[PDB]
Design a protein around this ligand. Structure first.
Ligand SMILES: [K+]
Ligand SMILES: [K+]
Ligand SMILES: [K+]
Ligand SMILES: [K+]
Ligand SMILES: [K+]
Ligand SMILES: [K+]
Ligand SMILES: [K+]
Ligand SMILES: [K+]
Ligand SMILES: [K+]
Ligand SMILES: [K+]
Ligand SMILES: [K+]
Ligand SMILES: [K+]
Ligand SMILES: [K+]
Ligand SMILES: [K+]
Ligand SMILES: [K+]
Ligand SMILES: [K+]
Ligand SMILES: [K+]
Ligand SMILES: [K+]
Ligand SMILES: [K+]
Ligand SMILES: [K+]
Ligand SMILES: [Mg+2]
Ligand SMILES: [Mg+2]
Ligand SMILES: [Mg+2]
Ligand SMILES: [Mg+2]
Ligand SMILES: [Mg+2]
Ligand SMILES: [Mg+2]
Ligand SMILES: [Mg+2]
Ligand SMILES: [Mg+2]
Ligand SMILES: [Mg+2]
Ligand SMILES: [Mg+2]
Ligand SMILES: [Mg+2]
Ligand SMILES: [Mg+2]
Lengths: 66, 98, 99, 50, 91
RNA sequence: ACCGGGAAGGGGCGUGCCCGCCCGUCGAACGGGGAGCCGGCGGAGACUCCGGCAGGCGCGGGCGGAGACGCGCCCCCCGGCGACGCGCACGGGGACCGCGGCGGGCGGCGCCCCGGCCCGCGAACGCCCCGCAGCCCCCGGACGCCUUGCGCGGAGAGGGGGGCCCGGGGGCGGACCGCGCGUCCCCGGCCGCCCCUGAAAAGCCGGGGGGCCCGCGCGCCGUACCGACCGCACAGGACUCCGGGGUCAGCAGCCUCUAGCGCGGGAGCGAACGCGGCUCAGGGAAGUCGGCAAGCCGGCUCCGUAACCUCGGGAAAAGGAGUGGCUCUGACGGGGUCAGAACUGGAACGGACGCGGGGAUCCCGACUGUUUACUAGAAACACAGCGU
């Protein structure tokens, strides 16, 4: 597992390298399941809005909160 | 140090009879600070509101565990086995039957 | 409490490659974890001192660039041994010929 | 031992499998009065050298 | 303050083995623990590492010598006589 | 059957060339070895199952720096890793262990009690930062730098600024908060020691010279349980690993948390005599082949110690005195120790436990060591030394 800067996150999505994304509410955790590593990005909810709209329609998103 | 507050709810203390002044009176005379009782009225004040004891202080802070100790001491007189003291929230205790 | 553990390896004979350390797990448990032997790094062919720049990892696990130094005789000679070979070569040519 | 060769495991496996009584229908079929199989063995008093 | 009067380094032996042996060891063992001079370093840092083997702790040069001292008296004379025989070979 | 090099002893490829001195896919379930962690599930299996997160080995779709140093292959030769002893101490990390706070839960309670007990958890692996010693670079040219100990310097110290290694730590991922004395384990730099100098190979890599992201897979065997083993079944014999608290010099003795709980069966009586124990007035070896057996001594601190001697010893020689509890004071840079004083108790204090009796001599063997497994441990054997 590893962390990632936001700009690298879309490029992995942009090249179809992700398999599933999870949004976690606590500061929000976004977890992307690639072939090699699980990657985690932490942003405030203001920032995660725009990123998910950019979300690749070929990339399954799920949500999670409790 | 600053001022913090605690409270003990005796809502189940209605069908059996429990004065709220006595329990307040019990705590008023027994509270110790630094193993002494001179200079308490000027730090720790027992109120009676909502049928529940309230301990507001001013400049004095201490553990919520001691507020539970004085409760089982005062309850030991004619309630040996009636009540179990449990935590409901932050600063509030609750008296519960068996 | 009681923190005693059992052996992790096939037999309990405590040779130099069967040493563990202890660690607490997220389920509140004391686990054993093997402590690998650390190989030496390469040593100079003329002086027997550690060559600078190479980590103490077996070279199978290091990328090609990580296994080298950027100089003639990079991982064979310690830098001072190179300079002494260079001077001996140049000066003997100056004395075996032209007096 | 917990660390045994497959060849010793197989010969031990056969002594376990054949360590049995005579079936009761065999006693009716063959009209027997000796009913004990005297080639049985028990682990506490045996010396299987296998 | 001086701790013994005669035995020196052979105080490690106690009352054992007799006087003639301990007398021999005091001389031998003092000699093999000594610091000798690098014939190359010119510094006083040569120490024995095994019987016959002497290393400068500053040069790092290794040398072949005596069992309990760097130079023996037979080898000094041999080196001196061999040198004069070579120079005599020169015309 | 036993013994053995002196034999025209095989490979790369692609024909055809080229290279070549001559065994072992025998011998280690503790040595060497490419790579695994957490959580969960079952009546009986788990580093093997399931879920999650990784790692290894395979297969298919010429630049920067002043410098120390930083950022595809093939053959011949030269090297490296694998790869290594013992030791008193000193230093660092981890785990353990304690004290205090704060959060949740218990117990008992004649008096006292914020004083008792239990629970407060974070792996492998990936990225960034930080790492004492130690070795290296640059300037420049010396009455210093520095360790518990040492050690180092014109073959270039100190000082200023840098590079590399470091089984480790931190932060983010994976996903409660402080402070301490010790204990064990590993690691580090030194120093000491030897007529003792403390394996090998597979495998993997570097140098010099010459020629030139996405998929799929990982076969074979062991794996239950046990001191259930050997002594005809049994107070015997039978290798290793993990190791809390109090008292204490302590892995001793004595008590204990966790965990675990057999040992061919019970009851009554309280004779002799036995077996293992305890105490005895007065005397004190008169007993006996013989002080056999038993008893005296014993921890720690201070005082005080002869003959003789291979000058190292003798030596705990011999002999003396003190020692609890409580209330305090001083010294050392938060921590135990060391020193001293008042008061007090049948005229007591290493209060159990643990723990030398001593001295004057003669014979034998110098000494530590070895032996008749099952009646002999010695004066016998060995030994360094000496000699042929
Ligand atoms: K088994
Ligand atoms: K058996
Ligand atoms: K023959
Ligand atoms: K072998
Ligand atoms: K072995
Ligand atoms: K093996
Ligand atoms: K080895
Ligand atoms: K080379
Ligand atoms: K198993
Ligand atoms: K009787
Ligand atoms: K009798
Ligand atoms: K007598
Ligand atoms: K006796
Ligand atoms: K005292
Ligand atoms: K003897
Ligand atoms: K001895
Ligand atoms: K005998
Ligand atoms: K004997
Ligand atoms: K003896
Ligand atoms: K003998
Ligand atoms: Mg083999
Ligand atoms: Mg092995
Ligand atoms: Mg099991
Ligand atoms: Mg070895
Ligand atoms: Mg098992
Ligand atoms: Mg008597
Ligand atoms: Mg007599
Ligand atoms: Mg008589
Ligand atoms: Mg003797
Ligand atoms: Mg003896
Ligand atoms: Mg005998
Ligand atoms: Mg005997």
């Amino acid at each position: 597992p590893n962390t990632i800067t936001e700009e690298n996150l879309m490029k992995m999505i942009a090249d179809g390298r992700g398999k599933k994304l999870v949004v976690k509410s606590c500061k929000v955790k976004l977890k992307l399941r690639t072939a090699k590593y699980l990657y985690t990005l932490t942003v405030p909810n203001a920032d995660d809005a725009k990123s998910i709209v950019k979300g690749c329609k070929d990339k399954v998103e799920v949500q999670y909160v409790n | 140090q600053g001022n913090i507050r605690f409270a003990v709810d005796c809502s189940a203390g209605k069908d059996l009879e429990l004065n709220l002044n006595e329990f307040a009176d019990y705590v008023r005379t027994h509270f110790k600070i630094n193993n002494r009782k001179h200079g308490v009225a000027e730090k720790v004040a027992c109120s009676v509101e909502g049928d529940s004891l309230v301990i507001q202080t001013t400049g004095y802070e201490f553990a919520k565990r001691y507020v539970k100790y004085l409760t089982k001491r005062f309850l030991y007189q004619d309630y040996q086995g009636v009540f179990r003291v449990l935590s409901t929230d932050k600063e509030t205790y609750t008296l519960k039957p068996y | 409490a009681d923190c005693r553990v059992t052996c992790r390896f096939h037999s309990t004979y405590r040779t130099r490659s069967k040493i563990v350390r202890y660690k607490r797990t997220p389920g509140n448990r004391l686990t054993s974890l093997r402590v690998k032997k650390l190989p030496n790094a390469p040593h100079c062919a003329e002086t027997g001192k550690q060559i600078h720049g190479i980590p103490r990892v077996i070279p199978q696990h290091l990328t090609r660039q990580q296994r080298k130094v950027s100089r003639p005789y990079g991982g064979k000679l310690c830098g001072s041994a190179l300079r002494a070979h260079i001077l001996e070569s140049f000066l003997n040519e100056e004395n075996q010929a032209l007096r | 031992t917990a660390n045994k060769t497959l060849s010793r495991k197989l010969r031990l496996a056969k002594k376990t499998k054949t360590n049995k009584n005579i079936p009761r229908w065999v006693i009716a079929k063959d009209h027997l009065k000796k009913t004990w199989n005297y080639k049985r063995h028990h682990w506490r008093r045996s010396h299987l050298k296998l | 303050a001086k701790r013994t009067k005669k035995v020196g380094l052979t105080g490690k032996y106690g009352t054992r083995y007799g006087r003639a042996a301990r007398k021999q060891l005091l001389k031998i063992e003092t000699s093999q623990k000594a610091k000798y001079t690098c014939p190359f370093c010119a510094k006083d840092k040569v120490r024995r590492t095994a019987c016959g083997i002497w290393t400068c702790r500053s040069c790092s040069k290794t040398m072949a010598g005596g069992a309990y001292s760097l130079h023996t008296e037979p080898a000094n004379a041999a080196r001196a006589t061999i040198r004069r025989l070579r120079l005599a070979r020169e015309d």
